[PDB]
Design a binder for this molecule. Structure first.
Ligand SMILES: CC(=O)SCCNC(=O)CCNC(=O)[C@H](O)C(C)(C)COP(=O)(O)OP(=O)(O)OC[C@H]1O[C@@H](n2cnc3c(N)ncnc32)[C@H](O)[C@@H]1OP(=O)(O)O
Ligand SMILES: CC(=O)SCCNC(=O)CCNC(=O)[C@H](O)C(C)(C)COP(=O)(O)OP(=O)(O)OC[C@H]1O[C@@H](n2cnc3c(N)ncnc32)[C@H](O)[C@@H]1OP(=O)(O)O
Ligand SMILES: CC(=O)SCCNC(=O)CCNC(=O)[C@H](O)C(C)(C)COP(=O)(O)OP(=O)(O)OC[C@H]1O[C@@H](n2cnc3c(N)ncnc32)[C@H](O)[C@@H]1OP(=O)(O)O
Ligand SMILES: CC(=O)SCCNC(=O)CCNC(=O)[C@H](O)C(C)(C)COP(=O)(O)OP(=O)(O)OC[C@H]1O[C@@H](n2cnc3c(N)ncnc32)[C@H](O)[C@@H]1OP(=O)(O)O
Lengths: 405, 406, 406, 403
């Protein structure tokens, strides 16, 4: 006998998290679970319980994500989606998805996002891969910059997490409106993102924080990294580098690249068009491995298309097919540009037909709509409409992965 | 040691010319490659330095034609065989050969020069910029199932000899490449080199095989070039090229390569960063994607080159271009372009964007975002909102792809 | 930003000092190592830069004593804990600390300084020269049989506790080191650090073990320090040190480690390049030998340092010494040395050899040939026959060995 | 199964002789190597056992000349092609061939024999001792910058054909080897084998290349032999120069060559000058192993032909187990400009075997270390110390070309 319910208490939450970690073949990291509890809404963490333990889980964090154009809209941060192997292939995931996607529409969140882990799972529920990330690595001795890179007058300082947290949120909130895909970070989220977890210490070492100051003393850049000593070939596992100006960005990177005793650097979760890739004088010296990052499930399709902005003017009619939620299917007229966006049901002839997962794949501008059509996954009903739609759905800045959840 | 800059005089000089190039690349001269590539080599375009006994520096270019964003096929100098012997390095020989070649490219009416960079950092100083990237796709074939909505069609496939392949694939190639910017036209001589069963590639894997995809009526609509590498069942497939005239033939041919019974891993080097195969696969992470440099672009005639291509969106921008190596190109260009029009003029109006010719070449094929180059500090915005609109126009819904090797 | 150069003020300042040093080395502060090394740390010899809140640069030296060729034990500055925080690097902080330290070393009557470089190329500019090498010996224990004429004696071996080891090994150590130039005297505090069962070394292998070799009459004549690394039977023995007062105890102790069941590979880092074990083995290639830097020498008082050691053969040579970092030491010195006498004085006679102070330090311990340095172009011979005779005199029949780590 | 000890009879016998040697080494006969090495092969010096159908054991020696400490070039038996077929091993065939060869070496007036040990423990019983070591130098070329005071000179380098290389390198080689003990004289026939573009080495790397360094006046002053392996590797065979500037310039040429990431130099000296030119000493990995074993056949002559780094007057009690006729007491009087060794009746200062005496003969092994190890016995205090210094040399011995 299985029961769908929410978390009743933190004792039930610690058992809720223990079962989820158990599905991932991991001992529950008590430090990570404790810090993430500070922003865990127990009414949003659902799952199945057989009266003796949890056998399935599915959660969602109330977060806010930057869209193309600078809008910060509410988004469901889907997390902790597990089914115990003794109850798999029985429909438990299908039920939780239907309950969560209805709950997401309740709270006004126009879409949902989550990290794929295995991408082929959520495509049936309407999720589409919309963001890719690149793992950048290589020898720091080969990563000299182009001779025209301006490092500026800035200064850098190894500092504690709190002086970091006293300036980094100001630096973060200033640059993310221009970085679609990034999510806002409350004080409770910065605590988890800067957490010195024991598990990451096993892989490299304790966390360290750098701040970049301009000549007048203003903080303008930060860095999160972990050193892995080795023999001399130590490794720098970079977690995040950001700057309010190109000089603070290049100065912070050149600081990490010039660190004595270091030979190899690693930056996982970076953008596929990270500024560092184009600063290096020799591109092949910085290996770039691209993979999935964020999947998108449009819950309010007309509001989602009207919440973002488009790189160029577009007037296209889309015949959307939501196989998972047939009430969302329809035919909308999208009238969008750099400064306007409207999406309403229309009875006019359709220009393009595609599923809701394909509409979500191209939503953040990370996947080309034209490529999906030439591949046979999207159908052009009127000539020329796909090419102009693929350009408008694009964006000069590629989407990037937010902090982990 | 008196050096003379000159072109190839005859085939005996041509073979010695190639011998030094292979020697600088630390390779024995491949006689099969050198002999078949001669058929399209213009001796007067192969320059270099000769000390009276042997070639000590080389630099050449093939007269080819590349597809631009918009479908235009324009002449391009396919730069190749750029070497300086290590005994004569750091003496200015490359800088001289670059000056003579780039001037010669302009004299022949070629608006641009393209190049496969072995070492990317070499040519940035000469005005070259990385404009196209390529991805090495690989993974376990048993994890590369397609999405359930992928239509494979009713076509049939035959593995056939190179000659029958060459009697049908060139027609297929010419039909699809107008929509694939970066691809180059392939004459019979270039098809002969591209399909050459070279011994060096046989060493890494095996003899070349050729596949043709036929529609239900017998019309050839797709092809594939690959080499097997047996191992123990632990065999690999090194895919050289896959193309089709419709989505069904493309997917059907890939499914053919993936369902080979003794194969476990497959590899496709030189694929597009937006190769359709990546989106056909049901589990994206099962197809590893490593991205690296492909083609560097050197704009030789900026006004003509910018007017020959089409732009994804309307743009009216003034570009302050600085060309340090070729200062005759430094100046301000007004670009007014769209999906069906393009015009470029040297102007004195106020500039909207400041950038070097190498960065302008980087964004020319729509493979590098002009906005990212500006956010990185390499490009300077002079008037608000200009870079955003220019970046979108310089883009293209189809990413540029790498042509056949040269 | 304001920096202040000062020494450690108290014990709480000592912890912060060592914490910054470990941080620059990208390591967590090892409290077991920091606690045991404090016992011989002189706070007035530990300098560094402080920005008012934390140490941003460190540089220290232990007052130690080193054996010279001939058996003389002279004071030496054991340089240690040289760090500059990455936020303050390449700004001259080390250069200043070097000037302060080298001047401070001279005041203490120390004629020379010694050093293990993390990166050797650092200290050449300050007058340091590589003078001693060490060899990492390793191989399969079942291939390391000894020559048939090697006498193992009638001794007995016992595995003992650290307390029993420290009550008998120092007497054995003190007896052998007069004939091993480069080895340093070990106080009880240094034995405590040298035998520390540090947690970091337990991770790489296992807990430290101690072995004592007893003669037939019960006299302890040899010892061994090693750590096991279990693995499957394919375990490793990581030998830290083996010593004996006679060839039988030396060979018997090694034979004990080599005959240990369940062991397959053995490793001995920091051995001498002329370690006796290398010549005991019947099949020399079975004992792999990798040679690398050990100790760098910085001569602070040239006349005294050259007069404190003995020379393998008679020499009467005039040396034109150039000291770029400390130009006050530059000058011309006449060296008169032999097996039982040594003198060095400023002279005005014609010079026989021209060399820098770093190269003079390189040959000072008899580990680097002055003839090779001259044939290499680093040292200039002014009068024929001088370098050959001087090179032999600066040598020694026993190669210098690396002391315990600092 | 009747075995006959005999020498090579003709050229057809030479092919079968060499083929059996390669077979024991589990290798197909390399015809390019066999053909070029015939030009300096003396058939009467190639002995072995033949069972009436095939060679079942081999042992040979090349008549060469080796540089000793002090610059003297003396004749030496370069022992080679020592094999015993696995169907006839452990029956004394090698021991018999050793007695015949060493007796033949004594009859030819050669005071010593030298040999490259495949397995070192084999020949110690016959009086051979490891006397010279070689170092394999390797590392990343981008980490091998030189010290700032290294003068590269104004010379120029050219890649040349084997023929052009062979018209200038031998003169450079002959000029420098008097100061490099262990190096052997190279006739044109030996240069042909040393520079042979053998097929076996082409598979491991590539075709052989040759470099010449010319002074400002056009005088060739250095050379280099290397093979490329396309993160490409350079396998350096030999680099030499007549002055420090040409030596460093040639190495700088190999280290700055484009597309190269790692370089390897097998058979280098343990005190190779390159090791001290590098600004970052640890960047040049150094692995040391056995090179040449020495078998002293005429102790008084061999010890008197070399020079000693310092004056010495020592009496050595030498034990020669395999050849007991050489056992006896020798007084050595040597220095930088004199050397004599004679049977004496004075009290002995040091006791050692002939194999250990051969080990220290080239100055590559310390007599003090052998004594401290228990292999050599000191009879009078202070004798080993002075003898060890004299038996040393300011230039470490180096390995000659392969044989
Ligand atoms: N993220 C994670 O995967 C965390 C760990 N999760 C798990 O271990 C679980 O097994 C889950 C969440 C992957 C699957 O949960 P289940 O309860 O087994 O899902 P459910 O039974 O509702 O059906 C899921 C559907 O998607 C498909 N699917 C789900 N997960 C996977 C997967 N990992 N690989 C392939 N197909 C999958 C199934 O084929 C099924 O369709 P079908 O069964 O009609 O053919
Ligand atoms: N293609 C190949 O890789 C062939 C192998 N070529 C080489 O080794 C040569 O060194 C070349 C062709 C790379 C350079 O040719 P050179 O004759 O040295 O050209 P030139 O003498 O005119 O100067 C080359 C310039 O480009 C730079 N450069 C050229 N090639 C490289 C390279 N591979 N890596 C880094 N910098 C390079 C040089 O530093 C120099 O710039 P500088 O003025 O700042 O020093
Ligand atoms: C204690 C021991 O046993 S050795 C421990 C020291 N080794 C370490 O790696 C400790 C970590 N500390 C560092 O790396 C420091 O940054 C150090 C050692 C490089 C010195 O700090 P700095 O303040 O930057 O040195 P300073 O500026 O005073 O002068 C250094 C000079 O030598 C050069 N140099 C110093 N260390 C190095 C090095 N590791 N690699 C290359 N060049 C170096 C500098 O470039 C400069 O020479 P220049 O005039 O040509 O530029
Ligand atoms: C470049 C050169 O010329 S060196 C190349 C020679 N090395 C080779 O491995 C070549 C291939 N040939 C062989 O291996 C032969 O079998 C050899 C070298 C072992 C000698 O052949 P054999 O006829 O068996 O030699 P022989 O019978 O005279 O043995 C004499 C002693 O040496 C010992 N011995 C010789 N070689 C070895 C060895 N590789 N391992 C162990 N013991 C050995 C024998 O056990 C025997 O010991 P003993 O006196 O206590 O009985």
């Amino acid at each position: 006998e299985l029961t769908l319910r929410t978390i009743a208490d933190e004792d039930d939450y610690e058992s809720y998290m223990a079962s989820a970690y158990s599905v991932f073949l991991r001992d529950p990291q008590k430090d990570e679970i404790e810090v993430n509890r500070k922003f865990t809404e127990l009414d949003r963490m659902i799952g199945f319980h057989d009266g003796k333990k949890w056998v399935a889980t599915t959660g969602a964090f109330s977060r806010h994500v930057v869209l193309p154009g600078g809008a910060v809209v509410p988004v469901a941060a889907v997390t902790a989606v597990t089914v115990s192997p003794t109850h798999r292939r029985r429909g438990l995931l299908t039920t939780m998805m239907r309950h969560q996607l209805a709950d997401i529409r309740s709270r006004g969140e126009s879409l949902a996002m989550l990290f794929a882990s295995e991408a082929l799972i959520y495509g049936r529920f309407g999720y589409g891969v919309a963001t890719e990330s690149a793992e950048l690595s290589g020898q720091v001795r080969e990563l000299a910059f182009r001779p025209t890179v301006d490092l500026g007058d800035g200064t850098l300082e190894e500092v504690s997490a709190e002086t970091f947290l006293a300036s980094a949120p100001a630096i973060y909130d200033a640059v993310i409106p221009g970085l679609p895909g990034q999510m806002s970070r409350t004080p409770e989220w910065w605590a988890s993102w800067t957490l010195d977890s024991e598990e990451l210490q096993k892989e490299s070492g304790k966390v360290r924080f750098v701040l970049h100051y301009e000549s007048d003393g203003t903080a303008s850049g930060f860095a999160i990294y972990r050193p892995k000593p080795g023999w001399p070939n130590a490794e720098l596992h970079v977690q995040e580098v950001l700057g309010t100006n190109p000089r603070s960005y290049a100065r912070t990177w050149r600081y990490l690249l010039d660190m004595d005793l270091v030979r190899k650097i690693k930056y996982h979760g970076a953008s596929v068009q990270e500024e560092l890739r184009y600063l290096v004088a020799n591109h092949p010296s910085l290996e770039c491995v691209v993979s999935d990052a964020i999947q998108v499930r449009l819950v309010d399709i007309p509001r989602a298309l009207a919440q973002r902005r488009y790189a160029a003017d577009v007037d296209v009619v889309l015949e959307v097919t939501d196989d998972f939620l047939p009430e969302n299917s329809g035919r909308y007229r999208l009238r969008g540009g750099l400064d306007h966006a409207s999406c309403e049901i229309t009875t006019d002839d359709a220009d393009i037909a595609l599923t809701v997962r394909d509409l979500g794949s191209v939503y953040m501008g990370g996947v080309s709509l034209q490529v999906l059509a030439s591949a046979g996954l999207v159908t052009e009903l009127r000539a020329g409409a796909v090419q102009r739609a693929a350009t408008a759905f694009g964006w000069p800045v590629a989407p990037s992965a937010p902090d982990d959840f």
